[PDB]
Design a protein around this ligand. Structure first.
Ligand code: XJ7
Ligand code: XJ7
Ligand code: 6IY
Ligand code: 6IY
Lengths: 537, 80, 79, 67, 80, 67
């Protein structure tokens, strides 16, 4: 084999498989070619930005990855040296891990990877019936299913989660079963192992807590078992727990609003408690407000500690955690300024109050229409309002500086006042003759009319047009993002659970077929999905 | 969503206002509603301390409601 | 014709500088109208900051859409 | 805006192309790195025995058909 | 502005003996799915007078397809 | 749940014309009403309503020959 660092370990068998020469592969295997040689040169590794092609470093994985069913069948089932199907590379990836890794979710890629995955698994069952091939974990601890979920390979995940194999001595490999049938109706059973909970790399946890760079994190939850599974968990318990949380937060904000509204107007806190009923209720409300702020503070800290976002995933993603955390930060700064004898605690408190009432929009998830609407609000803020505010603020600052330069020795002639007066045009309140403290009236009115045309007539109506294009284009994306948000809510509610709920599983230890590789009966905690098909009588 | 935002920023603003003509949830809610109909004064009172906090609250309310939610309503009615 | 129907940015930057130079001429000519030329130069320069939205795909495409709105819809509407 | 999406993308790309050409033509430092491709041997066999180096640009592609 | 002919020429690949030197697109190597193309860039990046990038960019605005011509593969990737 | 299901209902369900013919030859009751809750509405429990009768079962399963 090659000794060069770029192609270290490449045998002639790798070239023969690459060249799709079946006869050369047969001759090489006949002459004792090693069928578990590790081609681990720098060309064959990951880091796709460099030139290279990763296939799992082994010739069986090469033959599988290149869509050569004959060569994988031969290498597993040759007379001289059968290849170990559970062989592992430097990463710990098996053949199925390599097939998952090379997928890119295109139609032809999904077709061949699905077929090769199926055939490799079937051959593994035939040659090694006792082997649980799909339970092998690489050095990152990921099974092929967990690798598919973590990497966003929706084409492979969507195949695996509803896999049907009908051949005798292979039905145990299936993950979708049929318990019974009638005429148009039949009841399907989905495996559900390592989906709802396995304490390591459950598919729901892997998808929901992805780092936002996964290509299809929003689309992966639309597959047949996961969507119904999340809806079932929702309607089982999380709808009630979530609505209770929403009610509690509403009470919290009502109490905070009441306590802040009736703050004492005297100077220099802390305020002596006058012996009267209203002030006792006020002090109780303030204490509850600070208590809830501390609660959200520690919840945010727990989020950041449990997840450890890598300094960008907490700005591109998970906005609600940041917003609730900042609300609590404003509350705690308000407490510090309150006991420090500073009036600025009112400033911190009112920012906390406004932010909390706007964070009430968090709970629109769990309601489909309001949740999708809130998702669209998020996308408008991030894409259209951001571009608009960049260009708008550039124009506002430019024309404000020109106008305040023109104005001389007046009640205006500060940059702030002129900026505010030019901003008033945006809200339909611009005076257009707010001062006469200038010379050159034509210059003043030309500047203001140019500002009006460029901002109020052009940019606001253009913002309406671009938001129209956006709502025309983000419908399906908004529904998927809402479903992902509700999924994250479901997982957090299940992981909090507050009473040691035993009902973590969905639908009982149903017997699927009861034909393992041995004579034993396998129970898999299945999930039932009743389906109707008028075709295929 | 608009009434949630209106009530939130109205409560914040009336909390900031102290011993003034408005100084009440109804009057502040009405003054913040006036932005929606293109009649918001944006300096309707000076009975506070912390002018920066007042104007930041009103500008944030304006951006979140008048610029964003109304134009989004127009866009969504277009889609509908 | 290509001096006006195309290459708007060069024309706008040139006109900004023309306002600056006319401001200098009026400044040393003892005329207050240098303030008029200066403020037109200043406003035009801050609006010409939109030139640098290219090199960012989203802001660049947005600026191009602003250009086309001005040329087609705002022109017909303003007529 | 429903109709100028691709047109705006193309016009932006043209604007950035003009920027690139102006930046490389001005350049203020006599830097030769603007030649952007590198001198590779394409075939090395012209109609005569001589070899052809043609300053090519590499573009990697992936296909799952026509094996 | 003949975008069709330009799109033909810039990725021209002729698979026969004594004509491969005419090509402007070459495949240096090819693994199973992966293969690396090579585009010529003679008279594209820089040349005596009439570089294709300079000709397209500094066109007189009466060319038919001047906006769309830079989408032809080697030109877009070279500019990026 | 499968109350009232006769052999004729199973024969029609399995699409076996021969078994239906043999059962009707042996005096199978062609008006037997399958009154089981599996053969009724209220889909919260699995099932399939077909009108409870073998003729209606044959019609609802696209078995024109049995009809
Ligand atoms: C002074 C007062 C100022 C208030 C200003 C702010 C107003 C809006 C407040 C609205 C509160 C609702 C909320 O809680 O925040 C919204 C975010 O709205 C914004 O855009 C705020 C911009 C800052 C939802 O954030 P979310 O947690 O759902 O993040 C998504 C993930 O969940 C999901 O998995 C996906 O990865 C998705 O890509 C992620 O984005
Ligand atoms: C007192 C204050 C008055 C301010 C008035 C002016 C406000 C606008 C200021 C906007 C500044 C942004 C900018 O820099 O100018 C914009 C032009 O916006 C307009 O429409 C102005 C209408 C006049 C882009 O011009 P550009 O040079 O990119 O021209 C394109 C070519 O590059 C490209 O190759 C194609 O041929 C393409 O078809 C050409 O268009
Ligand atoms: C969508 C954005 C629209 C922009 C709206 C206008 C605000 C931007 C102002 C930018 C110009 C620079 C500001 C300088 C601040 C300052 O130093 O000016 C102060 C004003 O202080 C403040 O209110 C701070 C404002 C906080 C800014 C919150 C965004 C003092 O002089 P006054 O004339 O007001 O009082 C004088 C009484 N004889
Ligand atoms: C899209 C909604 C926009 C919101 C517009 C503002 C209204 C929301 C008010 C909510 C706060 C609670 C209201 C409390 C009522 C009250 O007690 O306020 C009363 C006035 O009562 C009313 O007008 C009832 C209003 C009926 C509500 C019709 C939606 C008097 O105080 P004044 O300061 O005005 O007069 C004092 C003269 N010395």
């Amino acid at each position: 084999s090659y000794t060069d660092s770029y192609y270290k370990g490449q045998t002639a068998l790798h070239i023969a498989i690459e060249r799709r020469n079946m006869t050369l592969v047969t001759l090489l295997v006949e002459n004792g070619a090693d069928v578990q040689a590790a081609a681990n040169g720098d060309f064959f590794k990951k880091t796709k930005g460099r030139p290279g092609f990763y296939f799992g470093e082994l010739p069986l994985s090469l033959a599988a990855c290149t869509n050569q069913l004959a060569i994988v069948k031969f290498l597993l089932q040759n007379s001289w040296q059968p290849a170990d199907i559970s062989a592992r590379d430097s990463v710990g990836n098996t053949v199925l891990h390599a097939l998952v890794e090379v997928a890119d979710n295109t139609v032809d890629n999904t077709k061949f990877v699905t077929s090769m995955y199926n055939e490799i698994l079937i051959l593994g069952a035939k040659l090694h019936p006792t082997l649980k091939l799909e339970e092998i974990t690489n050095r990152k601890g990921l099974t092929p299913l967990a690798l598919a979920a973590s990497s966003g390979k929706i084409g492979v995940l969507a195949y695996i989660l509803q896999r049907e194999i009908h051949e005798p001595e292979c039905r145990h490999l299936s993950r979708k079963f049929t318990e019974w049938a009638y005429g148009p109706v039949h009841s399907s059973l989905y495996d559900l192992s390592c989906i709802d909970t396995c304490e390591k790399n459950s598919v729901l946890e892997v998808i929901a807590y992805s780092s936002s760079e996964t290509p299809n994190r929003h689309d992966m939850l639309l597959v047949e078992p996961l969507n119904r599974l999340l809806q079932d968990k929702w309607d089982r318990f999380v709808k009630r727990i979530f609505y209770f949380n929403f009610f509690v937060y509403c009470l919290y904000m009502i109490i905070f609003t009441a306590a802040a509204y009736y703050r004492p107007v005297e100077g220099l806190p802390p305020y002596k408690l006058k012996n009267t009923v209203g002030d006792y209720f006020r002090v109780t409300g303030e204490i509850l407000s600070v208590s809830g702020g501390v609660y959200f503070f520690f919840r945010g800290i727990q989020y950041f500690l449990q997840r450890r976002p890598s300094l960008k995933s907490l700005f591109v993603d998970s906005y609600s955690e940041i917003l609730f955390f900042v609300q609590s930060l404003f509350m705690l700064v308000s407490v510090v300024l309150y006991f420090s004898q500073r009036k600025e605690y009112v400033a911190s408190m009112v920012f906390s109050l406004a932010m909390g009432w706007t964070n009430m929009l968090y709970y629109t998830r769990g309601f489909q229409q309001m949740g999708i609407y809130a998702v669209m609000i998020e996308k408008m803020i991030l894409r259209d309002l951001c571009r608009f505010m960049f260009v708008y603020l550039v124009f506002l600052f430019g024309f404000s500086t020109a106008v305040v330069t023109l104005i001389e020795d007046g009640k205006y002639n500060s940059l702030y006042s002129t900026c505010l007066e030019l901003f008033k045009f945006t809200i339909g309140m611009g005076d257009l003759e707010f001062t006469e403290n200038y010379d050159f009236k034509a210059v003043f009115i030309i500047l203001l009319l140019a500002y009006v045309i460029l901002t109020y007539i052009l940019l606001l109506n253009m913002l309406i047009a671009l938001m129209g294009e956006t709502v025309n284009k983000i419908a399906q994306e908004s529904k998927n993002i809402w479903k992902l948000q509700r999924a994250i809510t479901i997982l957090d509610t299940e992981k909090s659970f507050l009473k040691c709920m035993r009902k973590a599983f969905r639908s009982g230890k149903l017997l699927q077929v009861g034909f393992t590789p041995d004579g034993k009966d396998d129970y898999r905690w299945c999930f039932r999905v009743d389906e109707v098909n008028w075709t295929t009588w």
